[PDB]
PDB file of C-alpha atoms and ligand atoms in Angstrom:
ATOM      1  CA  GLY A   1       0.061  -0.094  -0.185  1.00  0.00           C
ATOM      2  CA  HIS A   2       1.011   3.641   0.547  1.00  0.00           C
ATOM      3  CA  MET A   3       3.889   3.117   3.005  1.00  0.00           C
ATOM      4  CA  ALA A   4       5.686   1.060   0.546  1.00  0.00           C
ATOM      5  CA  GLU A   5       4.887   3.137  -2.378  1.00  0.00           C
ATOM      6  CA  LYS A   6       6.918   5.965  -0.549  1.00  0.00           C
ATOM      7  CA  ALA A   7       9.703   3.934   0.887  1.00  0.00           C
ATOM      8  CA  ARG A   8       9.803   2.629  -3.040  1.00  0.00           C
ATOM      9  CA  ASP A   9       9.705   6.188  -4.128  1.00  0.00           C
ATOM     10  CA  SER A  10      12.647   7.217  -1.976  1.00  0.00           C
ATOM     11  CA  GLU A  11      14.728   4.253  -3.199  1.00  0.00           C
ATOM     12  CA  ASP A  12      14.148   4.707  -6.786  1.00  0.00           C
ATOM     13  CA  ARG A  13      15.088   8.407  -6.452  1.00  0.00           C
ATOM     14  CA  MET A  14      18.124   7.747  -4.465  1.00  0.00           C
ATOM     15  CA  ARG A  15      19.095   5.260  -6.831  1.00  0.00           C
ATOM     16  CA  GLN A  16      18.534   7.601  -9.614  1.00  0.00           C
ATOM     17  CA  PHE A  17      20.897   9.957  -7.676  1.00  0.00           C
ATOM     18  CA  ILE A  18      23.788   8.029  -7.443  1.00  0.00           C
ATOM     19  CA  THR A  19      23.627   7.214 -11.164  1.00  0.00           C
ATOM     20  CA  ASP A  20      23.807  10.952 -12.111  1.00  0.00           C
ATOM     21  CA  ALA A  21      26.315  11.527  -9.220  1.00  0.00           C
ATOM     22  CA  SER A  22      28.752   8.910 -10.427  1.00  0.00           C
ATOM     23  CA  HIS A  23      28.336  10.380 -14.001  1.00  0.00           C
ATOM     24  CA  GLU A  24      28.998  13.571 -13.072  1.00  0.00           C
ATOM     25  CA  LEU A  25      31.842  12.433 -11.024  1.00  0.00           C
ATOM     26  CA  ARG A  26      33.649  10.775 -14.237  1.00  0.00           C
ATOM     27  CA  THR A  27      33.830  13.885 -16.076  1.00  0.00           C
ATOM     28  CA  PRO A  28      35.953  15.798 -13.320  1.00  0.00           C
ATOM     29  CA  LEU A  29      38.290  12.571 -13.481  1.00  0.00           C
ATOM     30  CA  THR A  30      38.473  12.422 -16.932  1.00  0.00           C
ATOM     31  CA  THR A  31      39.617  16.274 -16.975  1.00  0.00           C
ATOM     32  CA  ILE A  32      42.375  15.557 -14.408  1.00  0.00           C
ATOM     33  CA  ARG A  33      44.011  12.410 -16.340  1.00  0.00           C
ATOM     34  CA  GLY A  34      43.804  14.446 -19.495  1.00  0.00           C
ATOM     35  CA  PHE A  35      45.541  17.346 -18.457  1.00  0.00           C
ATOM     36  CA  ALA A  36      47.972  15.514 -16.341  1.00  0.00           C
ATOM     37  CA  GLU A  37      48.715  13.529 -19.284  1.00  0.00           C
ATOM     38  CA  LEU A  38      49.267  16.722 -21.791  1.00  0.00           C
ATOM     39  CA  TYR A  39      51.662  18.254 -18.860  1.00  0.00           C
ATOM     40  CA  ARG A  40      53.716  15.256 -18.672  1.00  0.00           C
ATOM     41  CA  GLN A  41      54.191  15.312 -22.041  1.00  0.00           C
ATOM     42  CA  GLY A  42      55.431  18.798 -22.571  1.00  0.00           C
ATOM     43  CA  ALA A  43      52.555  19.914 -24.697  1.00  0.00           C
ATOM     44  CA  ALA A  44      51.369  22.708 -21.919  1.00  0.00           C
ATOM     45  CA  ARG A  45      52.623  25.313 -20.029  1.00  0.00           C
ATOM     46  CA  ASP A  46      51.808  27.003 -16.611  1.00  0.00           C
ATOM     47  CA  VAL A  47      51.665  24.275 -14.439  1.00  0.00           C
ATOM     48  CA  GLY A  48      49.822  26.539 -11.632  1.00  0.00           C
ATOM     49  CA  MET A  49      47.013  26.353 -14.315  1.00  0.00           C
ATOM     50  CA  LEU A  50      46.916  22.635 -14.509  1.00  0.00           C
ATOM     51  CA  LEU A  51      46.911  22.476 -10.305  1.00  0.00           C
ATOM     52  CA  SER A  52      44.340  25.034 -10.209  1.00  0.00           C
ATOM     53  CA  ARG A  53      42.133  23.107 -12.610  1.00  0.00           C
ATOM     54  CA  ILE A  54      42.663  19.870 -10.425  1.00  0.00           C
ATOM     55  CA  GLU A  55      41.769  21.873  -7.363  1.00  0.00           C
ATOM     56  CA  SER A  56      38.511  23.177  -8.892  1.00  0.00           C
ATOM     57  CA  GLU A  57      37.472  19.686 -10.052  1.00  0.00           C
ATOM     58  CA  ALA A  58      38.357  18.318  -6.939  1.00  0.00           C
ATOM     59  CA  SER A  59      36.219  20.823  -4.975  1.00  0.00           C
ATOM     60  CA  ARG A  60      33.344  20.221  -7.162  1.00  0.00           C
ATOM     61  CA  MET A  61      33.376  16.289  -6.776  1.00  0.00           C
ATOM     62  CA  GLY A  62      33.528  17.215  -2.870  1.00  0.00           C
ATOM     63  CA  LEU A  63      30.267  18.786  -3.179  1.00  0.00           C
ATOM     64  CA  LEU A  64      28.656  16.087  -5.434  1.00  0.00           C
ATOM     65  CA  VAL A  65      29.939  13.461  -2.838  1.00  0.00           C
ATOM     66  CA  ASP A  66      28.615  15.613   0.313  1.00  0.00           C
ATOM     67  CA  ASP A  67      25.158  16.027  -1.406  1.00  0.00           C
ATOM     68  CA  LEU A  68      25.090  11.848  -1.574  1.00  0.00           C
ATOM     69  CA  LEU A  69      25.830  11.752   1.786  1.00  0.00           C
ATOM     70  CA  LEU A  70      23.369  14.529   2.772  1.00  0.00           C
ATOM     71  CA  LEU A  71      20.609  12.577   0.654  1.00  0.00           C
ATOM     72  CA  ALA A  72      21.205   9.380   2.531  1.00  0.00           C
ATOM     73  CA  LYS A  73      20.385  11.206   6.100  1.00  0.00           C
ATOM     74  CA  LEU A  74      17.000  12.953   4.792  1.00  0.00           C
TER      75      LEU A  74
ATOM     76  CA  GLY B   1       2.270  -4.377   7.045  1.00  0.00           C
ATOM     77  CA  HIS B   2       4.557  -6.808   5.646  1.00  0.00           C
ATOM     78  CA  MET B   3       5.177  -4.472   2.326  1.00  0.00           C
ATOM     79  CA  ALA B   4       6.118  -1.516   4.190  1.00  0.00           C
ATOM     80  CA  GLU B   5       8.743  -3.253   6.054  1.00  0.00           C
ATOM     81  CA  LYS B   6      10.270  -4.855   3.369  1.00  0.00           C
ATOM     82  CA  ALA B   7      10.135  -1.758   1.377  1.00  0.00           C
ATOM     83  CA  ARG B   8      11.689   0.597   4.449  1.00  0.00           C
ATOM     84  CA  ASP B   9      14.197  -2.144   4.951  1.00  0.00           C
ATOM     85  CA  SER B  10      15.170  -2.250   0.824  1.00  0.00           C
ATOM     86  CA  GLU B  11      15.228   1.751   1.336  1.00  0.00           C
ATOM     87  CA  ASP B  12      17.529   1.855   4.524  1.00  0.00           C
ATOM     88  CA  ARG B  13      19.859  -0.605   2.923  1.00  0.00           C
ATOM     89  CA  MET B  14      20.020   1.731  -0.227  1.00  0.00           C
ATOM     90  CA  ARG B  15      20.635   4.705   2.253  1.00  0.00           C
ATOM     91  CA  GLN B  16      23.367   2.568   3.995  1.00  0.00           C
ATOM     92  CA  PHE B  17      24.711   1.675   0.510  1.00  0.00           C
ATOM     93  CA  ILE B  18      25.122   5.520  -0.580  1.00  0.00           C
ATOM     94  CA  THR B  19      26.972   6.390   2.713  1.00  0.00           C
ATOM     95  CA  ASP B  20      29.455   3.541   2.564  1.00  0.00           C
ATOM     96  CA  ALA B  21      30.082   4.155  -0.915  1.00  0.00           C
ATOM     97  CA  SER B  22      30.651   8.053  -0.470  1.00  0.00           C
ATOM     98  CA  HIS B  23      32.841   7.986   2.383  1.00  0.00           C
ATOM     99  CA  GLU B  24      35.083   5.571   0.095  1.00  0.00           C
ATOM    100  CA  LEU B  25      35.097   8.304  -2.567  1.00  0.00           C
ATOM    101  CA  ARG B  26      35.875  10.991   0.079  1.00  0.00           C
ATOM    102  CA  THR B  27      39.110   9.404   1.190  1.00  0.00           C
ATOM    103  CA  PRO B  28      41.341   9.695  -2.196  1.00  0.00           C
ATOM    104  CA  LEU B  29      39.375  12.990  -3.042  1.00  0.00           C
ATOM    105  CA  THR B  30      40.699  14.508   0.590  1.00  0.00           C
ATOM    106  CA  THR B  31      44.259  13.346  -0.724  1.00  0.00           C
ATOM    107  CA  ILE B  32      43.860  15.344  -4.258  1.00  0.00           C
ATOM    108  CA  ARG B  33      42.383  17.968  -2.441  1.00  0.00           C
ATOM    109  CA  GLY B  34      45.210  17.909   0.081  1.00  0.00           C
ATOM    110  CA  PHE B  35      48.084  17.810  -2.514  1.00  0.00           C
ATOM    111  CA  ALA B  36      46.919  20.726  -4.687  1.00  0.00           C
ATOM    112  CA  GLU B  37      46.588  22.809  -1.521  1.00  0.00           C
ATOM    113  CA  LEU B  38      50.054  22.076  -0.576  1.00  0.00           C
ATOM    114  CA  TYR B  39      51.103  23.268  -3.923  1.00  0.00           C
ATOM    115  CA  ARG B  40      49.334  26.537  -3.847  1.00  0.00           C
ATOM    116  CA  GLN B  41      50.993  27.070  -0.434  1.00  0.00           C
ATOM    117  CA  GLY B  42      54.386  27.145  -2.376  1.00  0.00           C
ATOM    118  CA  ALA B  43      55.272  23.920  -0.337  1.00  0.00           C
ATOM    119  CA  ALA B  44      56.042  21.773  -3.333  1.00  0.00           C
ATOM    120  CA  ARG B  45      59.208  20.748  -4.390  1.00  0.00           C
ATOM    121  CA  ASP B  46      58.720  17.766  -6.703  1.00  0.00           C
ATOM    122  CA  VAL B  47      55.584  18.564  -8.642  1.00  0.00           C
ATOM    123  CA  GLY B  48      55.951  15.036 -10.400  1.00  0.00           C
ATOM    124  CA  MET B  49      55.542  12.941  -7.268  1.00  0.00           C
ATOM    125  CA  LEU B  50      52.973  15.273  -6.020  1.00  0.00           C
ATOM    126  CA  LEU B  51      50.989  15.017  -9.508  1.00  0.00           C
ATOM    127  CA  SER B  52      51.632  11.176  -9.583  1.00  0.00           C
ATOM    128  CA  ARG B  53      49.697  10.594  -6.272  1.00  0.00           C
ATOM    129  CA  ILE B  54      47.133  12.851  -7.507  1.00  0.00           C
ATOM    130  CA  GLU B  55      46.863  10.706 -10.894  1.00  0.00           C
ATOM    131  CA  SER B  56      46.906   7.763  -8.790  1.00  0.00           C
ATOM    132  CA  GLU B  57      43.814   8.572  -6.411  1.00  0.00           C
ATOM    133  CA  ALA B  58      42.113  10.144  -9.758  1.00  0.00           C
ATOM    134  CA  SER B  59      42.212   6.453 -11.165  1.00  0.00           C
ATOM    135  CA  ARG B  60      41.084   4.708  -7.984  1.00  0.00           C
ATOM    136  CA  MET B  61      38.201   6.967  -7.712  1.00  0.00           C
ATOM    137  CA  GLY B  62      37.795   6.250 -11.203  1.00  0.00           C
ATOM    138  CA  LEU B  63      37.265   2.493 -10.560  1.00  0.00           C
ATOM    139  CA  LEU B  64      35.170   2.988  -7.601  1.00  0.00           C
ATOM    140  CA  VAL B  65      32.676   5.355  -9.471  1.00  0.00           C
ATOM    141  CA  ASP B  66      32.650   2.632 -12.629  1.00  0.00           C
ATOM    142  CA  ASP B  67      31.688   0.084 -10.244  1.00  0.00           C
ATOM    143  CA  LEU B  68      28.961   2.359  -8.261  1.00  0.00           C
ATOM    144  CA  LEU B  69      27.493   3.333 -11.671  1.00  0.00           C
ATOM    145  CA  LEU B  70      27.026  -1.259 -12.494  1.00  0.00           C
ATOM    146  CA  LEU B  71      25.696  -1.554  -8.666  1.00  0.00           C
ATOM    147  CA  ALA B  72      23.200   1.149  -8.957  1.00  0.00           C
ATOM    148  CA  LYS B  73      21.598  -0.909 -11.936  1.00  0.00           C
ATOM    149  CA  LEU B  74      21.425  -3.856  -9.583  1.00  0.00           C
TER     150      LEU B  74
HETATM  151  K1    K C 101      20.225  -3.005  -4.698  1.00  0.00           K
END
């Protein structure tokens, strides 16, 4: 009945979140990897921009991870 | 009733799963972030080593994330 429905709706919504989050974490991770490669190969300049980009991507990932943790507690 | 109880149990395991999985991502992330802050503070002598660790943690998270993506389907 209705309580089973709410719990199920809640589980389904969480499952989708984890899907979307995981897809969205994949993108920063590929960015870090790709940029790191280019830099190692000598194809780029300003290592401070590489590290600033890594800092940015990591901060974004932090917020995604924390969103999941908080969702779990709501 | 029975339906609600099974449904809640399934929902609470999903929440538990989401908490575990997210804490597991958090750990390599705090490394990447910490290492990038070291660099911004002027403290990095061997950036290649710093970058290597960063790459290693990113690849580790990459695998965690790919596995989460598959588990969210089960
Ligand atoms: K499941």
